[PDB]
Amino acid sequence: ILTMLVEPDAGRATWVAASAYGSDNTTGSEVTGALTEIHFSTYKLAAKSFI
């Protein structure tokens, strides 16, 4: 088997109001993301003959 990594989707920030500038909302929100993986395999094909 072979495994590779797949990058997640896109994020989005937040528009803050000028009112909330003093508080901790000025930072905005948290953008998160978890990776993923895929796998590959093989099958067997064969043939024979006699002389």
The contact set with another protein (CB under 8 A) reads: 1-7, 10, 30-37, 39
For the chain, the farthest-separated pair of C-alpha atoms sits apart, in whole angstroms, at 90
Nearer to another protein, 1 or 45 (CB): 1
Output the smallest distance, CB 44 to another protein, in A. 11
Output the smallest distance, CB 23 to another protein, in A. 20
Residue 46 exposure: Cα atoms within 13 Å on the Cβ side: 3
Output the smallest distance, CB 46 to another protein, in A. 15
Backbone breaks in the chain (C–N > 2.5 Å) follow which residues?
none
